[PDB]
Amino acid sequence: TCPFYKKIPGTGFTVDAFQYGVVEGCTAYFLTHFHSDHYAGLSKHFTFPVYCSEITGNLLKNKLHVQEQYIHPLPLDTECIVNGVKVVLLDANHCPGAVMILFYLPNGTVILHTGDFRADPSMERSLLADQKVHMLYLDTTYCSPEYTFPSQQEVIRFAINTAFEAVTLNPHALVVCGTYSIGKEKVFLAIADVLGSKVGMSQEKYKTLQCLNIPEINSLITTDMCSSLVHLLPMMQINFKGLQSHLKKCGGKYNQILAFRPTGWTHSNKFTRIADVIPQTKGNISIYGIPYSEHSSYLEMKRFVQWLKPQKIIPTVNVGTWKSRSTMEKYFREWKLEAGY
Numbered sequence: 001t002c003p004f005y006k007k008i009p010g011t012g013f014t015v016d017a018f019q020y021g022v023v024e025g026c027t028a029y030f031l032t033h034f035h036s037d038h039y040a041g042l043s044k045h046f047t048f049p050v051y052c053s054e055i056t057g058n059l060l061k062n063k064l065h066v067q068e069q070y071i072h073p074l075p076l077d078t079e080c081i082v083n084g085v086k087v088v089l090l091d092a093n094h095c096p097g098a099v100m101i102l103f104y105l106p107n108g109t110v111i112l113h114t115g116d117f118r119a120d121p122s123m124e125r126s127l128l129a130d131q132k133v134h135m136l137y138l139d140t141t142y143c144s145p146e147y148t149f150p151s152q153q154e155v156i157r158f159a160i161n162t163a164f165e166a167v168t169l170n171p172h173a174l175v176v177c178g179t180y181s182i183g184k185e186k187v188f189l190a191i192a193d194v195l196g197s198k199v200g201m202s203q204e205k206y207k208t209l210q211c212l213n214i215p216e217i218n219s220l221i222t223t224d225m226c227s228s229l230v231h232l233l234p235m236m237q238i239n240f241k242g243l244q245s246h247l248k249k250c251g252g253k254y255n256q257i258l259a260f261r262p263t264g265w266t267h268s269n270k271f272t273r274i275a276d277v278i279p280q281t282k283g284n285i286s287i288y289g290i291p292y293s294e295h296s297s298y299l300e301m302k303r304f305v306q307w308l309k310p311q312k313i314i315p316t317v318n319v320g321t322w323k324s325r326s327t328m329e330k331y332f333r334e335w336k337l338e339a340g341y
């Protein structure tokens with residue numbers, strides 16, 4: 001049964017609600033982004049209208065085989081009418097094709113559903129600037145002040161400089177980057193660019209990347225692993241056993257692996273600066289965990305909310321425990337008192 005926080009009152013609409021069977025009263029199913037916790041339940045047999053971005057639509061058709069007649073892609077930053085309700089899709093600064101959704105209810109209420117997002121000051125000059133929002137359905141993944149991490153730009157700077165140093169000292173080192181879903185493509189693209197290499201990967205992952213409208217992508221990626229010195233592997237294989245095994249398969253082309261695990265936040269964030277991060281090493285293999293986030297830090301989230309001044313906030317993440325819910329409600333009240341809305 002669909003939870004209440006995936007239902008948009010006053011409409012026939014649901015958001016990221018594909019694992020509940022047929023939802024009673026739902027005339028259109030929105031999907032914010034192609035991540036499995038959100039698409040769970042979609043397949044080639046789905047026969048209700050799905051509304052999403054162009055990129056999300058390419059992935060539904062090619063990866064999940066949803067039939068084309070049920071996929072309704074919408075342009076960003078454009079007022080559209082869906083089942084007689086005005087909507088707009090805005091970039092969520094999450095993974096490729098990820099959106100926030102603005103709904104303009106027939107009765108005058110305006111609702112923003114952030115989907116998954118990384119808040120940024122640039123959002124303060126989208127179409128949000130022009131009107132009031134009554135209700136905010138908010139990605140509260142990291143809604144606690146202990147959650148700090150660097151900018152995506154600092155994290156990429158660290159990774160490029162790390163990789164370029166290692167391979168310049170040893171031309172026979174391989175770089176490996178872990179992945180398990182779309183998102184964080186800049187990690188492996190920026191490293192391959194500094195090394196003058198294409199990124200090599202499985203056919204299934206190459207397929208996924210070909211759905212994403214990234215400019216000049218044929219220039220950046222390949223299925224020929226032998227021609228590449230930056231390889232992508234499933235995240236689960238980014239350990240000493242998995243990497244030893246991979247190095248065996250490269251036929252004595254390489255004699256060292258330097259590997260990256262993009263994570264979200266991890267508790268070493270409370271003690272260490274990005275500049276100071278060090279790998280785990282075993283023999284000729286080193287593994288760096290780097291805090292490349294595609295969700296808001298606590299400070300970014302707070303800044304966004306205090307700018308938007310919504311009348312009601314509905315969390316969409318961390319809602320399963322009373323202690324979580326109570327924690328988040330306390331911060332929302334502080335924010336409101338500090339800012340005066």
Ligand code: NI
Nearest residue numbers: 033035094116
């Ligand atoms: Ni996500």
